[PDB]
């Protein structure tokens, strides 16, 4: 349904780090041209082992540089940068964030969850939190369609779930790319059917991916 098509939705992504940058790129390539990207940190050389950007963006704000990359993917790309932390201090910035339909949290920070729950979004939004486990052995994937973010329930679900190719080893580019692909699919499924959803994915040593709750396959 066109009214449940993310390609027509404005999509804020709070956190232009490893997972957020790769998700933002995935969404831009499928046609999500109206993206907001919020991050106050600068890119550094140690980030490049697990990021969408290159050395040309080292020293630049992570949001501004990500938005430059995104606006080179498609002719109608209209990505916009917010070089600050959430929540903003300006009232203009807050009003700009309140124009986005889908608010996608990719920070891994519990304080950001608390800030989302406290911000006055002034209308119903499709909230989507996404983060990985410490060695990228799994992916927490929470979603909700409410005027205020449900921080308590999200935290509860996260706590309840809680060579170098092996998932137990530290995270590499391919680990984050795998969970950016699984999270982009989760983001598109949530927008197609909004509601309270929670899923926990797991990378296995044989190269397979599993989900809790189980849905497809044996």
């Amino acid at each position: 349904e066109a009214a449940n098509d993310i390609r027509s939705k404005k999509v804020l992504i709070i956190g232009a780090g490893s997972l957020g940058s790769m998700i933002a790129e995935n969404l831009m390539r499928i046609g999500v041209v109206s993206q907001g990207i919020l991050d106050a940190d600068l890119l550094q050389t140690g980030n490049l082992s697990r990021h969408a950007l290159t050395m040309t963006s080292v020293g630049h704000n992570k949001a501004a540089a990500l938005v430059e990359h995104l606006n080179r993917i498609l002719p109608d790309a209209s990505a916009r940068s917010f070089s600050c932390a959430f929540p903003p201090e300006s009232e203009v910035a807050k009003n700009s964030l309140r124009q986005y339909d889908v608010i996608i949290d990719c920070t891994g920070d519990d304080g950001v969850l608390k800030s989302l729950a406290a911000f006055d979004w002034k209308s119903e939004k499709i909230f989507i939190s996404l983060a990985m486990t410490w060695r990228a052995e799994g992916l927490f994937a929470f979603a909700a369609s409410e005027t205020s973010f449900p921080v308590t329930d999200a935290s509860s679900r996260f706590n309840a779930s809680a060579g170098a190719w092996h998932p137990v080893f530290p995270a590499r580019a391919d680990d984050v790319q795998l969970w950016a692909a699984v999270g982009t699919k989760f983001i598109c499924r949530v927008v197609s059917a909004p509601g309270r959803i929670y899923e926990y994915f797991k990378q296995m040593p044989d190269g397979t991916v599993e989900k809790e709750p189980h849905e497809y396959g044996s």
């Binding site: 997972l19 990985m132 486990t133 996260f158 809680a162």
Partner: peptide
């Protein structure tokens, strides 16, 4: 729950 993005 430790989470890394």
């Amino acid at each position: 729950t430790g989470r890394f993005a």
